[PDB]
Design a protein around this ligand. Structure first.
Ligand SMILES: CC(C)CCC[C@@H](C)[C@H]1CC[C@H]2[C@@H]3CC=C4C[C@@H](O)CC[C@]4(C)[C@H]3CC[C@]12C
Ligand SMILES: CC(C)CCC[C@@H](C)[C@H]1CC[C@H]2[C@@H]3CC=C4C[C@@H](O)CC[C@]4(C)[C@H]3CC[C@]12C
Ligand SMILES: CC(C)c1nc2cc(O)ccc2c(=O)n1-c1ccc(C#N)cc1
Ligand SMILES: CC(C)c1nc2cc(O)ccc2c(=O)n1-c1ccc(C#N)cc1
Lengths: 531, 177, 101
């Protein structure tokens, strides 16, 4: 199990000896024999190394270019360039898992990644290695974006090969040239539309533990592709949704403000203002039904893993909770109960707070909202823990001192909380003995929480703003990208034809001889240097 | 409106003064209101002359940058919070603070260190009243107001080195005029 | 004109052939692609072959175009917008570290 299935050829290549591997490969030792040992697998809970479960991948992952070329274009035994292991990882899949984005590794993997593809072209012109999937159904392009391997993902998206007969493998062509200007095209295949795993969908719908998820959207084809979708059709729909939500919240506010004050609902219909008020209540209920169904629809379509629901996409939970409050309000109202007012005011406050969702769609407001979220997650929780400890301890001491009215724990906690908002009495009661004890306790509480802890929070906030300011423009762009993908699936949902990016254009010739047509996206660049 | 907004302000004060005269000669008491607006605007217009002194001019440029960068966003978020919580509180209140204007002013006092937290008792469901007020206080006072001070400090750091050049541009326009 | 193509390819011998042939150097290509046209992609060079060499760092061609004997280009020629060669040189610059030199 630890080293089961290991062959002699594994040892020779690992020692990086050209003559030693030449002997065994010539001898007819199996090159397709796989060592399915857990030491060679991922096994995140144990130390080890992963290389692809195949001797052919071992040379590629160890920078053995000469051995790799020997293993394939020889005559005695030609290794299977398309062989898949138990997990299904091809040699191209194993090359992605080896990379770790560090400064030196990227130059190694991408350079080796290019030559193994070119060799496959000269050997198997009809075979396309990039579209092979493992047991999970991930192509090497899809797995690179999924695992946060930004260095290799950039190479794949804009791969431009100058050599004839390998130009058809490229993804970033060139239309024409000018003096400082050159026009380039992009493949844009399986990026925005795909059978199972689009590149955009994989990046956006991650579990937030991907190391460079914010940064993978800054590569050249992806950044302008999303901006094109926004400026074309998505932006106008987003403004329409903001306007309708504003109108819904104003009608809800007006209907609750004019509620009758008689007893035992439901209330009878008279005058003409009751017909206008009942109309407003019908619209408020219908709005809460719509947000209730959009909440379970989201869960069924995405299936969050209970960790990407509170750290990411917490706005869906808040809209769903507001809908739940509205439904509870209706249920209580039709049961002759007065608590429907309490449920309705909670619903009103939550609905007005939910308006902050739409700060995305404006750059400055969106960056401001991201900063607010960061400070809430970094500073407020720690401040609250220490503050609650101090408040509870000193309140219990003060209330134990008091004798026969503030002789309640709730009353004394509220008196001490007023010091935080600039309204502390400092003489609120006199029903005690030992007046010196009362003053010493209150003065110690004031110095610790007001002069020290509250002023310290302002200083700690300033340090957070300094460190997160530069990157915050990229978190906002990730938030807006999720909005763009959600709108596309929901609104159109029947043709998916008016929103298509790019256009069919001719870029080259198939190596067989056919004409290859790809949906290309035009990008313009200017270079006054390097004439 | 982005440049030369001082011309607009001096012109607006002149308009207020002319309206004051027109109302005065028509036997109307609102001339006092127009005249007090004119007085306040005229005293505020004195800040035009901070150009012509280097330190005061740089200070004025910094004030303008802060107003254009932080206050507008702060006001949008603050008004959203204030209006929502005020509507909820006033809907809870029963038969005097049973007005939207009265309840908005009570909640605004928390921002200036004057919040009552027990300003009314004409309600049922006392637990609902205190939960709503405590949530509003934590969001706007402890969090949003202290955050504005931290965001101002970042603006000062970035624009301090360059502000001596904006002042010299403003004084150059004065020289040509 | 044909002279526009030869200079754009930055071939000193090729432009020498056409300039010798008597092709008009004062012919202006008033195309929107060659204009500013901020709402569309393109490039501006001055609407004149003489300015084209100047904006493309073709010093040898510029000297050839002016102090030769066959056809001397008009150093004071103005296009439809009125931009002289000196005017076109200003709009080419973009303040970047290398362009200014
Ligand atoms: C009292 C009721 C009626 C209205 C209050 C609205 C409150 C609950 C809304 C306003 C802003 C919201 C918070 C905004 C951001 C975050 C950080 C996030 O990662 C977890 C959710 C959390 C913590 C939200 C929880 C609920 C919240 C506080
Ligand atoms: C209430 C009346 C009587 C007196 C108030 C005086 C006020 C309006 C003066 C004092 C400072 C002034 C502001 C100073 C700077 C700016 C930024 C500028 O780019 C737009 C104008 C604007 C926003 C001014 C508008 C009016 C202003 C607020
Ligand atoms: C914390 C911010 C102010 C916030 N608060 C909310 C409160 C709610 O009750 C519901 C939803 C939201 C909400 O979406 N955001 C938010 C988050 C990120 C971006 C970005 N980019 C824009 C807005
Ligand atoms: C914001 C500053 C304080 C200001 N406020 C004004 C208010 C008014 O009501 C009218 C005019 C002004 C006004 O000019 N400035 C201003 C602007 C730039 C410089 C510079 N350098 C000096 C002064």
């Amino acid at each position: 199990s630890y080293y089961k299935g290991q062959t002699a050829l594994h040892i020779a290549i690992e020692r990086r000896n050209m003559a030693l591997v030449t002997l065994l490969v010539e001898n007819g030792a199996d090159v397709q024999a796989a060592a399915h040992g857990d030491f060679f697998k991922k096994t995140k809970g144990r130390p080890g190394f992963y290389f692809g479960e195949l001797p052919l991948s071992l040379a590629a992952c160890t920078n053995q270019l000469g051995i790799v070329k020997f293993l394939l274009q020889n005559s005695w035994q030609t290794a299977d360039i398309s062989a898949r292991d138990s997990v299904g990882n091809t040699v191209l899949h194993a090359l992605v898992e080896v990379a770790d984005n560090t400064a030196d590794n990227t130059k190694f993997v991408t350079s080796m990644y290019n030559e193994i593809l070119m060799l496959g072209a000269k050997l198997h012109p009809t075979l396309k290695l990039e579209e092979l999937t493992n047991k999970k159904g991930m192509t090497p392009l899809a797995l690179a974006a999924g695992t946060g391997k930004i260095g290799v993902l950039a190479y794949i998206l804009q791969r431009e090969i100058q050599e004839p007969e390998c130009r058809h493998l490229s993804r970033k062509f060139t239309e024409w040239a000018y003096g400082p200007v050159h026009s380039s095209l992009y493949d844009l295949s399986c990026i925005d539309t795909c059978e199972k795993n689009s590149v955009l969908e994989v990046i956006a719908y991650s579990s937030s533990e991907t190391p460079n998820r914010h940064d993978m959207l800054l590569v050249e084809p992806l950044n302008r592709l999303l901006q094109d979708k926004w400026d074309r059709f998505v932006k106008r729909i987003f403004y329409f949704n903001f306007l309708v939500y504003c109108l819904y919240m104003i009608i809800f506010t007006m209907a609750a403000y004019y509620r009758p004050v008689d007893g035992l609902p439901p209330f009878k219909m008279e005058k003409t203002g009751d017909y206008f008020r009942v109309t407003g209540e019908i619209l408020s209920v219908l709005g809460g039904v719509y947000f209730f169904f959009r909440g379970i629809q989201y869960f069924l379509q995405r299936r969050p893993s209970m960790k990407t629901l509170f750290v990411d996409s917490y706005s869906e939970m808040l809209f769903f909770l507001q809908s739940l409050f509205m439904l509870a309000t209706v249920v209580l109202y039709f049961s002759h109960l007065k608590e429907y007012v309490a449920s309705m005011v909670f619903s009103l406050a939550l609905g007005w707070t939910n308006m902050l969702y739409y700060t995305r769609g404006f750059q400055q407001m969106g960056i401001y909202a991201v900063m607010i979220e960061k400070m809430i997650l970094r500073d407020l929780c720690r401040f609250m823990f220490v503050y609650i400890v101090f408040l509870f301890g000193f309140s219990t001491a003060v209330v134990t001192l008091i004798e026969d009215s503030y002789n309640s724990l709730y009353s004394t906690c509220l008196e001490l909380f007023k010091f935080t908002i600039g309204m502390g009495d400092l003489e609120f009661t006199e029903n005690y003995d030992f007046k010196a004890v009362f003053i010493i306790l209150l003065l110690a509480y004031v110095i610790l929480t007001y002069i020290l802890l509250l002023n310290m929070l302002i200083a700690l906030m300033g340090e957070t703003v300094n460190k997160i300011a530069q990157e915050s423009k990229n978190i906002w762009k990730l938030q807006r990208a999720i909005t763009i993908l959600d709108t596309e699936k929901s609104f159109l949902k029947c043709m998916r034809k008016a929103f298509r990016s790019g256009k069919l254009l001719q870029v080259g010739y198939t190596p067989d001889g056919k004409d290859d047509y790809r949906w290309c996206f035009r990008v313009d660049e200017v270079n006054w240097t390097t004439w």
